[PDB]
Structure formats: structure tokens, C-alpha cells
Amino acid sequence: TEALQSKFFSPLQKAMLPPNSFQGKVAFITGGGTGLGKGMTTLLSSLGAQCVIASRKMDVLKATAEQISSQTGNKVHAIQCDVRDPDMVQNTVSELIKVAGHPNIVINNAAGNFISPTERLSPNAWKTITDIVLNGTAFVTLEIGKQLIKAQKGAAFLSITTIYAETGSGFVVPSASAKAGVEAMSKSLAAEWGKYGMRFNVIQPGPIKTGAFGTFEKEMIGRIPCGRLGTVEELANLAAFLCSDYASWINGAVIKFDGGEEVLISGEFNDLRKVTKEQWDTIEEL
Amino acid sequence: NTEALQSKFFSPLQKAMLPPNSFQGKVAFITGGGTGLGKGMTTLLSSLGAQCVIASRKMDVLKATAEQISSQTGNKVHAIQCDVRDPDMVQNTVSELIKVAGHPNIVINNAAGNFISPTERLSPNAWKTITDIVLNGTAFVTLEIGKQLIKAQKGAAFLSITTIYAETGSGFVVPSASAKAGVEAMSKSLAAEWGKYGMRFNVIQPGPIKTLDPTGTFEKEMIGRIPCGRLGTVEELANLAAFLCSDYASWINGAVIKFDGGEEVLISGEFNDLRKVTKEQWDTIEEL
Amino acid sequence: MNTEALQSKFFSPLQKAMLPPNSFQGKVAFITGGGTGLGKGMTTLLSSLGAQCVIASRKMDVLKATAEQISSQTGNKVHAIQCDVRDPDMVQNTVSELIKVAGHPNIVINNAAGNFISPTERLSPNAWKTITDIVLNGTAFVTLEIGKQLIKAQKGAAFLSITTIYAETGSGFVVPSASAKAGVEAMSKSLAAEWGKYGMRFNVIQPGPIKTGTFEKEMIGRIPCGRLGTVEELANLAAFLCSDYASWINGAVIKFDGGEEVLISGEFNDLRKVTKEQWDTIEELI
Amino acid sequence: MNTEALQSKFFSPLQKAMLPPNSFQGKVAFITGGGTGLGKGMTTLLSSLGAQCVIASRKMDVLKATAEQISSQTGNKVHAIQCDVRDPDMVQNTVSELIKVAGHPNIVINNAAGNFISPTERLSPNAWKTITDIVLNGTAFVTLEIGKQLIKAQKGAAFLSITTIYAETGSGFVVPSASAKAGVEAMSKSLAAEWGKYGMRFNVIQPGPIKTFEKEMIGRIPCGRLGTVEELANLAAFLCSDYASWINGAVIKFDGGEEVLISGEFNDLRKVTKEQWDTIEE
Numbered sequence A: 001t002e003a004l005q006s007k008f009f010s011p012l013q014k015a016m017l018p019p020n021s022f023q024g025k026v027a028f029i030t031g032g033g034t035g036l037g038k039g040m041t042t043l044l045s046s047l048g049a050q051c052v053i054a055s056r057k058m059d060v061l062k063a064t065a066e067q068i069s070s071q072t073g074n075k076v077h078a079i080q081c082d083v084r085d086p087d088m089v090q091n092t093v094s095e096l097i098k099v100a101g102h103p104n105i106v107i108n109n110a111a112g113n114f115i116s117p118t119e120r121l122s123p124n125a126w127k128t129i130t131d132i133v134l135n136g137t138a139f140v141t142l143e144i145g146k147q148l149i150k151a152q153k154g155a156a157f158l159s160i161t162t163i164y165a166e167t168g169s170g171f172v173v174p175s176a177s178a179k180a181g182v183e184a185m186s187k188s189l190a191a192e193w194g195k196y197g198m199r200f201n202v203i204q205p206g207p208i209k210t211g212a213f214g215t216f217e218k219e220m221i222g223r224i225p226c227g228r229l230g231t232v233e234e235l236a237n238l239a240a241f242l243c244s245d246y247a248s249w250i251n252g253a254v255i256k257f258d259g260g261e262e263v264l265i266s267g268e269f270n271d272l273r274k275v276t277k278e279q280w281d282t283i284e285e286l
Numbered sequence B: 001n002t003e004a005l006q007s008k009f010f011s012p013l014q015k016a017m018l019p020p021n022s023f024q025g026k027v028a029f030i031t032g033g034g035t036g037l038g039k040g041m042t043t044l045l046s047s048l049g050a051q052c053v054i055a056s057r058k059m060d061v062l063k064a065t066a067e068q069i070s071s072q073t074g075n076k077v078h079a080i081q082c083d084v085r086d087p088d089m090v091q092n093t094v095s096e097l098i099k100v101a102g103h104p105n106i107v108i109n110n111a112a113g114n115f116i117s118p119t120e121r122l123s124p125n126a127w128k129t130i131t132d133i134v135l136n137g138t139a140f141v142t143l144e145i146g147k148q149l150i151k152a153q154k155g156a157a158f159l160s161i162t163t164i165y166a167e168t169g170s171g172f173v174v175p176s177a178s179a180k181a182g183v184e185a186m187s188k189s190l191a192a193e194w195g196k197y198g199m200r201f202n203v204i205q206p207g208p209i210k211t212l213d214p215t216g217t218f219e220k221e222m223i224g225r226i227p228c229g230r231l232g233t234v235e236e237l238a239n240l241a242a243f244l245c246s247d248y249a250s251w252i253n254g255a256v257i258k259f260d261g262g263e264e265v266l267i268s269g270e271f272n273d274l275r276k277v278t279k280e281q282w283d284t285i286e287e288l
Numbered sequence C: 001m002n003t004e005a006l007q008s009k010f011f012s013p014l015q016k017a018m019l020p021p022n023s024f025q026g027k028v029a030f031i032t033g034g035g036t037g038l039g040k041g042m043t044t045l046l047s048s049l050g051a052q053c054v055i056a057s058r059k060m061d062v063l064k065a066t067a068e069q070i071s072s073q074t075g076n077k078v079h080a081i082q083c084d085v086r087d088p089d090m091v092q093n094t095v096s097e098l099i100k101v102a103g104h105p106n107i108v109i110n111n112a113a114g115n116f117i118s119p120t121e122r123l124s125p126n127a128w129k130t131i132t133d134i135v136l137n138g139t140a141f142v143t144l145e146i147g148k149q150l151i152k153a154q155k156g157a158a159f160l161s162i163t164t165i166y167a168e169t170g171s172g173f174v175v176p177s178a179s180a181k182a183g184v185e186a187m188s189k190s191l192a193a194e195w196g197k198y199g200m201r202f203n204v205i206q207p208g209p210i211k212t213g214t215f216e217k218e219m220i221g222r223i224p225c226g227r228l229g230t231v232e233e234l235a236n237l238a239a240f241l242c243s244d245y246a247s248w249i250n251g252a253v254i255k256f257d258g259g260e261e262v263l264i265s266g267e268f269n270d271l272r273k274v275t276k277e278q279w280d281t282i283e284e285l286i
Numbered sequence D: 001m002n003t004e005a006l007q008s009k010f011f012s013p014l015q016k017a018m019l020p021p022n023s024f025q026g027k028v029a030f031i032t033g034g035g036t037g038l039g040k041g042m043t044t045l046l047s048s049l050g051a052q053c054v055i056a057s058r059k060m061d062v063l064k065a066t067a068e069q070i071s072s073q074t075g076n077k078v079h080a081i082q083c084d085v086r087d088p089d090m091v092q093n094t095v096s097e098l099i100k101v102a103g104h105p106n107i108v109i110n111n112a113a114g115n116f117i118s119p120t121e122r123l124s125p126n127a128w129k130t131i132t133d134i135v136l137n138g139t140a141f142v143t144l145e146i147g148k149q150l151i152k153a154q155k156g157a158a159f160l161s162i163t164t165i166y167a168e169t170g171s172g173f174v175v176p177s178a179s180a181k182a183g184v185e186a187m188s189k190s191l192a193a194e195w196g197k198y199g200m201r202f203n204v205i206q207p208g209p210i211k212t213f214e215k216e217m218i219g220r221i222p223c224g225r226l227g228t229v230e231e232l233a234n235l236a237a238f239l240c241s242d243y244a245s246w247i248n249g250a251v252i253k254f255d256g257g258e259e260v261l262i263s264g265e266f267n268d269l270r271k272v273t274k275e276q277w278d279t280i281e282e
């Protein structure tokens, strides 16, 4: 059964958009030094965007910024920023505008998470997650938005959440709550700031080869109809699409990128997929 | 006519729905219980026999309300001063709750703050203030009560009051929409995670409840967007709350109930603006 | 105490009438599928509370036996009318008889349904169509006809549709049901909006499994409340929604599932079996 | 610059092909209602990008004129097959022909629909049933038949249903449509889960109003204009492409923000101007 999934759901890990389509465009990406943020930056730069990446670890940031800069031939700028601090965010936005200009693409990708029984969390642990995910995305959006309105310019905004932002989930509760907050913000500002030329969309990723929580991966895939984890390149292509001018009428959308995981686990009778064809013949007799 | 039809068939029943003394021996904890919706909920639960404990920042109003309800129902209402955004204040509040009344059977997360403002006019501190009261406050209260319930091998029904815009978003109330959305995801998360400890979690999403008013013309415009043709009442909301926090709803867990007179379905439906089309105009349209 | 004991102690079913004696005096209720299972349960409670109930379904014999049984129990007369809801002519006659024998309904419960549990590939076009007809078209026809008569008479009513938790999420193996049930949900939200000016409000209950081969025990493991629901509990919820206490509840969709949907839908809820001791080891890794 | 100027500048439609030239070569696409409007636009893009297209609907004349017109424009052959989707036999015969003239589909688009805008109380039972039959049962029959054939041939495909933003919310005045479309969404999510093992994936686009008087609805669209057929086609093509091979069970709004605008309780405050907001905070 995995031969059908491998042949018909095989990943296409190369650029989807036309060459140089992001030339003249400036992108700002929180968490752009690692994992998903890095892949989005990698693609946007390769397609001609001037990228600006921000997070806490300047060492990883600079290394990644230089690595992509030489790989694509387009300059990637690194700026140190803790998104939960409004003054640092203010500085980062100001520096973004000086070294690159007002952004056409804003990607809120920075996150933190604990996997834990909720009863083992301290108030500070809870607050930490809310600060990075919700308030951090809020501060970045508030400041850039304020500058864009000031400069009579618009932009595409993108927030990366999770499939559990919409459903909730035990064991990742502060994240689930913060991420749900991030989605509500996108929907709110898609409505409010459309008049300013700003649009807001969301990707809800399932487990991507970077999941979280050798035998565990095999178990995870059993809950994924597409029979595999996602890839950073595939996610980047989706992100680039939503941040591109081809999607200029996509606003307030929320797109699952999960190989079908959410629809599988959420469906009441989907546990019946374990039933074999011979067993079904017996049940259909009654 | 429309007005007389709505008034007759959507008439508010503002009396206790549940059987008298149905909450005897139960203890309820209500954040924001001193005013508005919290007060209405406290008043009903106390009237039905519950021992209530109400918590908020303003001790004077909280004490006044607690004494007012106590005298009306003959059941004690305890006031405790608490800023829910302060985890240490929350810890001491829950500690006092357990000593004065007992472990709660009912926990109502009702305290909130809001600004109506263009988002561009908000400071980071204004945004954070709302997130702090709504999301972190409800989290801190839930976390600490939950910890004490698990320790005590006891369960409880939890209720969070959100808004119809928690699920949809809304411009002009963005910090609130975000924080209230977080509150809903928390309820769904802990309905699942903590069912095994005897805790269940539900949500009511209220539309506008009768509680800038000036001419009264704004209310007239608000009602045009409500199918039921009126604002809701505190007593009706309280009945819904009491039901969800009652043993009759012991199998209701992770539910989200709109209490809005049909407002959300009206405004969200793409072609609902066609309600302003007359019978005559429809005749010509159906003839095209 | 263990999980089971906490669930038993703190989610115990209260299977007696919730609303005050005689609260439905002078109310007429129309309940499709009112002769068996959930429909019979709702009919029993409404009648006991004073309503004049009219039940309608295909099997006149089962319908008559139920109507007699409830009439003798409660003292209040329950009328039985033979109706296949997918037949619009039969629905017309049924509503005409309803108005003649009882009066214009104050409560309309669309409860009749059909369902197959089967791999979708095994379904014939007729098998699919059969489910759509009973569930979606049947609820539509009953709703259209009563609505037309209520508008004519300048009378209002509370409408209630019983769907399922999988109407919102979808689910394999019950696909025609999921589609038809989702349709029934959209209908309620649509008419909640459209027909408020006529004094008609529309709400929905989404039930999980309600108690009536070892799979019963298996379902419970996916229910945070640790048991199946009961008919009496569902009836209480139904009565509340169809009562004047809920006269401002309109367009609501209420899960009645012991937390099943939130449990199965949450990505990390598969970690629920990890014990106190095992969690210490996981936290040691992070 | 004013609202209309920013909206036009930063939400300008890009109506050219997004995906790489010939990216759909060796792929067969089956589109219901492919002879007109949105179906026509998706067929045109898929054919121009190299796909072998098959279109199916009731009106053979239009279904031949569009197919010939696309064939000559793109150079790639488009086949026309008469099919009323609400009839299982016509569907079965249509699936058999699709496999004969082109082969097993790699792309299935369920786009065919019918609608009335009417107060619900003026609808006959037949009028309701018509919409349910075309939209829900029609999509079901097409999906069931093609699905069955793909399982038998051990072949996979990407499925795409075009619904509406009101499928999720419901809406007065379009009730049979809202219901049937809601059902189509549920079907997609259901089969996304059920048929993963068969290599079949299912997604949904929910469009707002597309430019194919009624222009005051633009005041309810944050992006400040109606959408275009070419923009929708680009989104549709992406979802039906191998670039989207891990996208499954998704529902994408393509509405310029209309749904979030109308559904948000306080969004009716959008006309309040800069000057007016000062006194409110006092």
C-alpha cells in the first residue's frame, strides 16, 4: 500500500514559481535561521527576494544569512531580535527599513513549544510560550503595520501555526492557545487592514522532516494519509505562493499542509481503516 | 409584522430554569463575579444553593456584590481580591478559595478587558494588557485550580466566556479576538487532556447582552443584525451557564455554544444582505 | 483514584427531567424518527413535560406502539403519522395532518436518519443517494413545508436538527452520512439567518455515541468522559434548546460527545496513556 | 493614497500562468462544467500548461465550442463529453469514455453546479432537490465512479471541488446550494482520510465573487475588487500539481478577504474615518 503513496504523493522539492519573480521584493522572516524559516528564506532569495532574517542567536543567523547569500547571489541580512521585546522589535523593523526597505513580505515564523502534561507547567513556562508565539507575532505585526500605513505601502503577511491551533490539543496547551491567537489575529487584520493594502494568510503545518515528540516516525506516518512527513522545500513553495503577487486575492485564508493528518485523526470512524477487506465482507452480511 | 413576530416568539424567560436547590453543596468560583455577566451568573448559582466565591481587582465592588447576593439568597458569597494576570495573586486566591469554601465544583473564567480601537493606534502595552487579562489570566486560574484538583483527586466543570468574534476574528478588537481565541483552544485542549481527572471544559460565545449609549440609536442598529430582533439578557445567559456547569451536562465536554440571537450566522452568510429585498422586488428578480 | 473512578464520580449521568414540571404545556412538538432511539427519548421527555407530541416515520406499527406507550406513561396524547421524509408529497400530507390533529408546531425536531458503515468503494450510487435523500432532502422537505405553513399562519417555532460530530470534520466509512449531515448543519445556519423575521430559530446538536461486539468498550477509550452518553441526557439538552429558556439561542451547534471530538482531533492527544513515571523520563531528554 | 488606490496597487491581479511551461505534460484532467466560466478558465490553464483535458456537462454545443477554441489556442487536445452529473449511468458512461479517449485521470475537478437566489419559502421541493442532485449527488457520483476505477487500476489522482465561502457559514437565500456545497466539503475531508492508501488526495477552493448591477459587494471585499478567472485557475492548478502532493484535506478561501470581513462582529466600523476615531476614545 506504500508503493501507491510513494509513487502518487512523491515530493517535488524544487522551485515552483518562475525565476526572478521576487526581484525587487523585500522579505522579513522571524526564525529565518533554522528549520522552516531557513527554507522559506532560501527559496525567496533564490527567486530574487532581498531577505532579512531575525531571531535571538546571531551566530546561527549570520551563518545562515551568509550561506544563502553565496548560494543565490542575493544578499540576506541578519538582525538579532527577541520578538517578545517591543523595543528590540522596533529596532529590528527600523534596521529592516534601512538596510533593505519596507517589506513586501512579512513572515511570522518564530515559535517556542513544550510537550508536557499541563499540570507540570509553571505559570512562567506558560507565559514564555504566549510571549514568543502570540505577543511576538503581535509586536512584529503592529510595528511593521504602523510603518507601512505611515509610508502608504502594503504587504503580504504570513503566519505559520499548526494543525492543533484550530482543534486544541492536550500536552501542547500554551502553544495551542497562542497559535489559535495568531490565527484570529490574521483573520482580524485581513479584514481591518485590507484598506491599507495589507493581506494576511496562515499555513497550518503537520509534521515536517526537520516531526516532534527511529520507531516514532514510523508510528507518526500511520496517521498521515499521504504516507510520509512533509518537506521544508514543499512548505516553502506553499509559503512563496501565498506571499507572491499570484495570490494577491488570497486574504484571510488558512491552509492545512499536513498530508491529510488532521482529517484522518479528527474523523470519528477513521479508526476503521485497520479493518481488512475480508473482515468487511463479514460485516456487510449483517 | 417582523417586530411583533420576534417579540412574541423570541420572548426572554428570565427566571431560574434548573430545579430549586439543584446546586446545594456545590462550590463555584467566578472571576469577574462582582459585575455584569459574572454577577448575573453568581446570583443564579447562589439562588440555586451554590456556595459562591467571586474574584476581581476591586474589593469594594466585590464585597458589595457578595453581601447583596448573600442577603437575597441566604447562601454565602465570598469575595477575594485578585488580579488574574498575576500568578502569585492567583495562587493565593485559589489557596483562600479552598480554605474558606472548598475545592470548586464549578470554575467560571469570566474576567476580561477590551479596547475598541483601530489596531494601528494600539501600543505594545495596550495589546499585552488584553492578552494578559484574557488569555494568561484564564490560563493562570485554570492551571492552579487544575493542579489543586488533581492533587485532591477531585474534578470540576469549567466554563469560559468568550465572544462570537473569537472564532471569526474581527477588526477593531484584535487583541481581544486573539486572546479569546486562545481561551477557546485552551478549553478544547484541556477537555481532552484533563477528562481523565474528572474535569470538563466548555465555552459560551455571547453576542451583545443588554448591560456611549446616549440616543439609543446604536442599539437600534445592532438589533438589525440580530435575527431574534433584540439583545440578550443577563438572566438568559446565566441559565445557559448554570446548565453547562450542572450535572445535567456531565457529558458535555469541549463544546462551544453561541448565545447571540443568531447574530453570527446572519453577518457571516454571504447573501444575508438580501434580507433588505422586498416581496415586490423578488417577483421581478424571479421573472428575469 | 484511577481514571475510571474519577470519570465515574465526576461525569455521572443525571437521567431525570431537567426543566420544570409542565414547562411545555400548550406546546406542540413534531419529531421525525420519534418512534425509536433518540427520537423516542426526546418525545418521552417533551410529553412528560406537557407537550402535545406528533411523531412521524415509515413503520406505522412501531410508531403506533411507541405513541401508545408514551401516552399511557405521561398521560399526554402522542399522535403517530406515517411518513417517509424523502417523499415530498407524503411530507405535505403529514404536515397537513399535524396541523389538523395537534395544531401548528412550536417545536420541530429533524431526527430521522439512515446510515451505512462501509468503505466508500463498496457503495453503489443508489446507496449513497438513499442516505442523502433521508438525511438532507428529508430534513429539507420537512423544514420547507412546516416553514411555509408557519409563515402563512404568522407563527414561529424552534427547530432542532440532530447531526453527528463527524458532520463538521468529515469521516471515512460514513461518507454519504457525513456529507448529508454537513448539509443539514448548513441548512440550520442559513435558516437561522433567513427566517428570524418569521420567529423561527434553528439549532443543532452533534452527538457522539449514545448507549442503547466489544467495540463499545473500544469507543470509550476515545472519550475523555469515560463512558457513552445516555438518551435521557440528550433529551434534556434537546428540551432546553427547544424551550423558551433558549429563545435567544439561534444558529448554535452543540457537541454532546463526552469530549470525543476534541480528544481524537488533537494532534498530541495520543500521549494520553503515558504515566506519571514515564513523563519524568521524557522531560529528562528535553 | 486612498483605500481604492492601495487596494489596486498592492492587490493587483497577476493573470498570467504561474506554474512552469509544460508542467502538466503527461497529465489528464477531467473537469465538470469545463465548458463555461470558472471550469473554462481552469481547463484553459491546464491545457496551456500541457495537460490533456476532458470536459463534461449537459450542453454539447457549448462543450464543443470551448473545447475546439482551447485546442486551437494551446495546441493541446481537449475532449468534450456530454454528461448530466446527477445521472449515475451518464456518469459511468462518461468515465468509460474519459479512460478510452485520454486515460485514467491524474486531476479531477468537480466544478459543475446550479443555484437559485431566492427566499427559501418560494422554493418547491423539486427546486431544492435539483440543486442537491447537481451539486452534492453529482459530485458524489463522479468521485465514486472515478475513484472506483482508480482503485482497480492501482492509480492515484488529485481531486478538487469548487465550493463557496457560504458552504462553511451557511447563508439565507442560497440554502439548497449552501447545504449541498457544505456536503461536498465534508465529502472531500472524508475521502482525504479514507483514500490516502489509494493515492488519492482531496482539496477544496471556496471562492468569493469572480468577474466572469451587482458591484456594491466590492464594499464587502478587503482586497477592493472582484477576483478573476485566471487567478482562480492558478490556485486550482497549484493544488492539482505535484508541488502540492502533500496538500490533502485542505479548504482554501479565495475571496479577497470577504468572509473574514463580513463575519467579524466589529468590522462594520471600517467606514469610520481617521478624524472620527478621535472623539470615540474620549
Ligand SMILES: CCCCCC(=O)SCCNC(=O)CCNC(=O)[C@H](O)C(C)(C)COP(=O)(O)OP(=O)(O)OC[C@H]1O[C@@H](n2cnc3c(N)ncnc32)[C@H](O)[C@@H]1OP(=O)(O)O
Pocket: A111, A112, A113, A114, A115, A116, A120, A121, A122, A123, A124, A125, A128, A161, A162, A175, A206, A207, A208, A211, A212, C283, C286
Ligand atoms: C508536528 C507539530 C509540531 C508542533 C510545533 C509547534 O506547534 S511550535 C514549536 C516551536 N518550538 C520549538 O520547536 C521549541 C521550543 N522551545 C524549546 O526547545 C525550549 O525549551 C525553549 C526555547 C522554549 C526554552 O525557553 P527559554 O529559553 O525562554 O527558557 P524557559 O522559559 O523554558 O525557562 C523558564 C521556565 O520554563 C520551564 N521549563 C523549561 N523547560 C521546560 C519543559 N521542557 N517543560 C516544561 N517547562 C519547562 C522552567 O521550569 C522554568 O520555570 P520557572 O521560571 O517557574 O522556574
Ligand SMILES: CCCCCC(=O)SCCNC(=O)CCNC(=O)[C@H](O)C(C)(C)COP(=O)(O)OP(=O)(O)OC[C@H]1O[C@@H](n2cnc3c(N)ncnc32)[C@H](O)[C@@H]1OP(=O)(O)O
Pocket: B112, B113, B114, B115, B116, B117, B121, B122, B123, B124, B125, B126, B129, B162, B163, B176, B207, B208, B209, D281
Ligand atoms: C458586544 C460585544 C462586546 C465584546 C466584548 C468583549 O469581547 S470583552 C468586553 C470588555 N469591554 C470593555 O468595555 C472593557 C472596558 N474596560 C476594561 O476591561 C478595563 O477597565 C481596562 C482594560 C481599561 C483596564 O485596563 P488596565 O488598567 O488593566 O490597563 P491599562 O488600560 O491602563 O493599560 C495601559 C494601556 O492601555 C491603553 N489604553 C487605555 N484605554 C485605551 C483605549 N480606549 N484605546 C486604546 N488604548 C487604550 C493605554 O494607551 C496604555 O498604553 P500605554 O501605557 O503604552 O500608553
Ligand SMILES: CCCCCC(=O)SCCNC(=O)CCNC(=O)[C@H](O)C(C)(C)COP(=O)(O)OP(=O)(O)OC[C@H]1O[C@@H](n2cnc3c(N)ncnc32)[C@H](O)[C@@H]1OP(=O)(O)O
Pocket: A284, C113, C114, C115, C116, C117, C118, C122, C123, C124, C125, C126, C127, C130, C131, C164, C177
Ligand atoms: C454504529 C454507529 C452508528 C452511527 C450512526 C449514525 O451516525 S446516523 C444513524 C442512522 N442509521 C443507522 O444507524 C442505522 C441504520 N439505518 C438504516 O438501516 C436506514 O434506515 C436504511 C438506509 C438502511 C433504510 O433505507 P432503505 O430501506 O431504503 O435502504 P435499502 O437498503 O432498501 O436501500 C437500497 C440500497 O441500499 C444499499 N445498501 C443497503 N445496505 C448497504 C450496506 N450495508 N452497504 C452498502 N450498501 C447498502 C443496497 O445495495 C441498495 O442499493 P442498490 O439498489 O444499488 O443495490
Ligand SMILES: CCCCCC(=O)SCCNC(=O)CCNC(=O)[C@H](O)C(C)(C)COP(=O)(O)OP(=O)(O)OC[C@H]1O[C@@H](n2cnc3c(N)ncnc32)[C@H](O)[C@@H]1OP(=O)(O)O
Pocket: B286, D113, D114, D115, D116, D117, D118, D122, D123, D124, D125, D126, D127, D130, D131, D164, D177
Ligand atoms: C454568486 C453565484 C454563485 C453560484 C454558485 C453555483 O454553484 S451555480 C451559479 C449560478 N448558475 C446556476 O445556478 C445555473 C443553473 N442552475 C440550475 O439550478 C439548473 O442548471 C437549471 C435550473 C438552469 C436547469 O435545471 P432544470 O433542467 O431542472 O430546470 P427546471 O426549470 O426544470 O428546474 C427545476 C426547478 O427549478 C425551479 N426554479 C427555476 N428557477 C427558479 C427560481 N428563480 N426560484 C425558485 N425556483 C426556481 C423550477 O420551478 C423547477 O421546480 P418545479 O418543477 O417544482 O416548478
Ligand SMILES: NC(=O)c1ccc[n+]([C@@H]2O[C@H](COP(=O)([O-])OP(=O)(O)OC[C@H]3O[C@@H](n4cnc5c(N)ncnc54)[C@H](OP(=O)(O)O)[C@@H]3O)[C@@H](O)[C@H]2O)c1
Pocket: A030, A031, A032, A033, A034, A035, A036, A037, A054, A055, A056, A057, A058, A060, A081, A082, A083, A084, A108, A109, A110, A111, A112, A132, A136, A160, A161, A162, A163, A204, A205, A206, A207, A208, A209, A210, A211, A212
Ligand atoms: N517543524 C515542524 O514539523 C512544525 C510543525 C508544525 C508547525 N511548525 C511551525 O513552524 C515554525 C518553524 O518551525 P521550526 O521547527 O523550523 O522551528 P525551529 O527551527 O525548531 O525553531 C524556532 C525558530 O524560532 C526562533 N525563535 C525562538 N524564540 C524566539 C524569540 N523569542 N524571538 C525571536 N525568534 C525566536 C528560533 O531562532 P533563535 O533560537 O535564534 O531565537 C528558531 O529559528 C514554527 O512557528 C512552528 O510552530 C513546525
Ligand SMILES: NC(=O)c1ccc[n+]([C@@H]2O[C@H](COP(=O)([O-])OP(=O)(O)OC[C@H]3O[C@@H](n4cnc5c(N)ncnc54)[C@H](OP(=O)(O)O)[C@@H]3O)[C@@H](O)[C@H]2O)c1
Pocket: B031, B032, B033, B034, B035, B036, B037, B038, B055, B056, B057, B058, B059, B061, B082, B083, B084, B085, B109, B110, B111, B112, B113, B133, B137, B161, B162, B163, B164, B206, B207, B208, B209, B210, B211
Ligand atoms: N456584555 C456583553 O455584551 C458581552 C459580549 C461578548 C462577550 N462578553 C464577555 O462576557 C464576560 C463578562 O463581560 P461583562 O460585560 O460583564 O464585563 P464587565 O462587567 O464590563 O467587566 C469585566 C469584569 O472582569 C473583571 N476584571 C477585569 N480585569 C481583571 C483582572 N485583571 N483580574 C481580575 N478581574 C478582572 C472586572 O472586575 P474588576 O474591575 O474588579 O477587576 C469585571 O468584573 C467577559 O469575558 C466578556 O468578554 C460580554
Ligand SMILES: NC(=O)c1ccc[n+]([C@@H]2O[C@H](COP(=O)([O-])OP(=O)(O)OC[C@H]3O[C@@H](n4cnc5c(N)ncnc54)[C@H](OP(=O)(O)O)[C@@H]3O)[C@@H](O)[C@H]2O)c1
Pocket: C032, C033, C034, C035, C036, C037, C038, C039, C056, C057, C058, C059, C060, C062, C063, C083, C084, C085, C086, C110, C111, C112, C113, C114, C134, C138, C162, C163, C164, C165, C207, C208, C209, C210, C211
Ligand atoms: N444513536 C447514536 O449513538 C447517534 C450518534 C450520532 C448521531 N445520531 C443521530 O441521532 C438521530 C437518531 O438516531 P438513532 O440512534 O435514534 O437511530 P434509530 O434508533 O435507528 O432511529 C432512526 C429513525 O429514523 C427513522 N427513519 C429512517 N428513515 C426514514 C425515512 N425515510 N422517513 C422517516 N423516518 C425515517 C426510523 O423510523 P422508521 O424506520 O419507521 O422510518 C427511526 O425511527 C439520527 O439523526 C442520528 O444520525 C445518533
Ligand SMILES: NC(=O)c1ccc[n+]([C@@H]2O[C@H](COP(=O)([O-])OP(=O)(O)OC[C@H]3O[C@@H](n4cnc5c(N)ncnc54)[C@H](OP(=O)(O)O)[C@@H]3O)[C@@H](O)[C@H]2O)c1
Pocket: D032, D033, D034, D035, D036, D037, D038, D039, D056, D057, D058, D059, D060, D062, D063, D083, D084, D085, D086, D110, D111, D112, D113, D114, D134, D138, D162, D163, D164, D165, D207, D208, D209, D210, D211, D212
Ligand atoms: N463565479 C463565481 O463568482 C462563483 C462564486 C462562488 C462559487 N462558484 C463556483 O464555481 C463553480 C463554477 O461556477 P461558474 O460561475 O463558472 O458557473 P457557470 O459558468 O454557470 O458554470 C456552471 C457549470 O456547471 C455545468 N452544469 C450545470 N448543471 C450540470 C449538470 N446537471 N451536469 C453536468 N454539468 C452541469 C454547466 O454546464 P451545462 O449548462 O452545459 O450543463 C456549467 O458549465 C461552481 O461550482 C460555483 O458554485 C462560482
